[PDB]
């Protein structure tokens, strides 16, 4: 907050207050609907059958039961089919091409792959030093701070075959949503692939659903009688569409720079105050808002989000003060 | 320090006429403060205290 004023903080969050007519069950469902869902999450098992005109792989995906994954992730069999048809196969063929490539680009064998004394001091020995020391300044930054600063089907199959490099058959359990199966034929000369494993990797990347920037939404216990949802990730405009479940006027965020961009400097100022106060409140440390307001007013003195680092300091009218900083 | 991690810094060399004195007419060589105990729970020192007196007797 204070030292980097990061646009990219480690755990960005929005807090969404929910209307009273939204029951607790509806809230829980709503969370599932805006949370990211990967293809692997709904797959129970993948079975791959390989045979040897060319070398062929039959990839059969067994999902969990339709009712189970709808309930768990709010995912429809249509959404599921849709991801396999589009972004999954693409990624898989992509991965395959890249691996076939590798089988042609040749290890070369005989060529090589290209203070602790004080760390050994116990706390008594270390304090014997610190006790006599007359410090020049505050502590030098640690390593962290340094690092920083069947015809609907028949045709859908042909549609898929013509949009891809290796597929020869394709079918989806359109009725019950329990499986998907398709067949890849690769060139006869191609030497063996760990196809099941290539497939595993692409599954864990394939995104069934996802709101841009949002990962998981969660329903925590009503803190102070404020009924609220909490998202890993920030996207205000997307939330502006859920007016039916949440009071958009009371959405708040972790992320000072997001708030700045969407709501302006005064909003961002408040967010800084609250966020710094949240830091101390968790450790039961009490710090007057009078200090916090000043720190935040300072940070926003140019209508922006200025850190207490080189850049913020660089504006100062005093050259002697800068000369004595860095 | 005793052998129970109760380390102390000498604050005064207290005149023996000014020390507390026992029914036995003895003055303590060392004073340790009772408030040095409830946070550290060196109950083994209390045991050593009895055992050592009983041994000397």
């Amino acid at each position: 907050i204070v030292m980097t004023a990061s646009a990219a903080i480690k755990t960005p969050q929005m807090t969404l207050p929910i209307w009273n007519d939204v029951s607790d069950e509806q809230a829980d469902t709503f969370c599932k609907s805006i949370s990211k869902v990967l293809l692997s999450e709904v797959i129970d098992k993948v079975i791959v059958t390989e045979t040897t005109a060319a070398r062929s792989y039959v990839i059969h995906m067994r999902f969990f039961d339709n009712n189970e994954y709808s309930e768990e992730y709010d995912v429809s069999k249509e959404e599921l089919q849709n991801v396999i048809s589009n972004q999954f196969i693409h990624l898989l063929e992509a991965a395959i091409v890249k691996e076939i490539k590798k089988q042609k680009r040749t290890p070369d064998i005989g060529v090589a792959v290209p203070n602790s004394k004080r760390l050994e001091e116990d706390n008594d020995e270390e304090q014997s030093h610190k006790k006599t020391k007359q410090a020049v300044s505050y502590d030098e930054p640690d390593e962290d701070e340094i690092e920083t600063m069947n015809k609907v089907q028949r045709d859908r199959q042909s549609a898929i075959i013509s949009h891809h490099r290796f597929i020869t058959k394709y079918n989806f359990d359109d009725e019950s949503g329990k499986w998907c199966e398709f067949k890849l034929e690769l060139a006869a000369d191609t030497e063996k692939l760990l196809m099941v494993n290539i497939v595993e990797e692409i599954c864990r990347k394939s995104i069934i659903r996802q709101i841009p920037h949002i990962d998981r939404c969660v329903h925590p216990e009503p803190e102070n009688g404020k009924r609220v949802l909490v998202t890993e990730g920030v996207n205000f405009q997307a939330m502006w569409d859920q007016e039916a479940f949440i009071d958009v006027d009371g959405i708040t965020s972790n992320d000072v720079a997001a708030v700045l961009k969407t709501y302006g400097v005064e909003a961002a100022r408040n967010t800084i105050v609250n966020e710094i106060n949240n830091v101390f409140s968790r450790y039961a440390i009490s710090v007057s808002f009078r200090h916090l307001d000043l720190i935040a007013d300072m940070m926003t003195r140019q209508g922006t989000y200025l850190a207490f680092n080189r850049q913020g300091m660089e504006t100062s009218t005093s050259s002697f003060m800068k000369m004595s900083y860095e | 320090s005793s052998r129970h991690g109760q380390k102390g810094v000498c604050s005064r060399k207290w005149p023996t006429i000014d020390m507390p004195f026992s029914e036995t007419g003895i003055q303590p060589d060392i004073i340790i403060n009772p408030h040095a105990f409830p946070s550290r729970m060196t109950i083994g020192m209390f045991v050593e205290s009895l055992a050592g007196k009983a041994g000397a007797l």
């Binding site: 204070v2 030292m3 300044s137 505050y138 502590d139 030098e140 930054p141 640690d142 962290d144 701070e145 000043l294 720190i295 300072m298 207490f308 680092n309 913020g312 300091m313 100062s316 003060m321 004595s324 900083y325 | 009772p34 408030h35 105990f37 409830p38 946070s39 729970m41 109950i43 209390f46």
Partner: protein
């Protein structure tokens, strides 16, 4: 630091109710009948499953800890102050805790009643690949003691097993200050130099 004879009876009577606690907790986390034997083939198979997975082991630890902790609270609630040989104000150990001079009710209770569950970063006591938490416990023991529940108290001493586990708990905070220490100095300099 002494309980009365009446109080020491209270203590051991309540402590005797922890005897089955670990097994009840195991049967609950493994989703078996509440009265499942501690050496039941299925129970041991499921415990071994639990051992291999960090999240699952976490559950077993949290649930078992919660139960044994309730026992601990019962013992303390009954014995301090009602079971103490000397009462406040004559009892200096209590008086220091109550008056804010030094110590705490927690510290008094670990002297007079029991140390309690030894806790390491929210979990209990580490388990070897063999499923034993120490050479003296059999694989998948469900005794709370085998998971670092210490019924001993500083007054009457702690067993070798409890002692060892209690070393773990003691060392924990010191290891944490050695590795997980963030300094605040650079931050202070930068605030003051700009706000001076």
């Amino acid at each position: 630091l002494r309980l009365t004879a009446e109080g020491n009876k209270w203590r051991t009577d309540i402590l005797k109710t922890s005897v089955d606690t670990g097994r009840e907790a195991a049967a609950e986390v493994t989703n078996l009948d509440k009265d499942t034997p501690a050496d039941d083939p299925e129970l041991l198979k499921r415990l071994q499953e639990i051992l291999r997975d960090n999240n699952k082991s976490g559950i077993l630890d949290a649930v078992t800890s919660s139960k044994v902790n309730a026992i601990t609270s019962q013992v303390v609630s009954k014995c301090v102050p009602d079971g103490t040989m000397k009462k406040f104000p004559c009892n200096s150990m209590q008086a220091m805790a109550l008056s804010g001079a030094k110590g705490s009710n927690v510290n008094v209770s670990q002297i007079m009643c029991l140390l309690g569950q030894q806790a390491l970063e929210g979990r209990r006591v580490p388990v070897m690949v063999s499923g034993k938490t120490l050479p003296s416990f059999k694989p998948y023991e469900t005794d709370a003691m085998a998971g670092g529940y210490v019924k001993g108290r500083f007054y009457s001493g702690i067993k070798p097993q409890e002692y060892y586990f209690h070393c773990m708990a003691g060392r924990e905070g010191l290891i944490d200050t050695a590795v997980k220490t963030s300094r605040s100095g650079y931050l202070q300099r930068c605030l003051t130099k700009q706000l001076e």
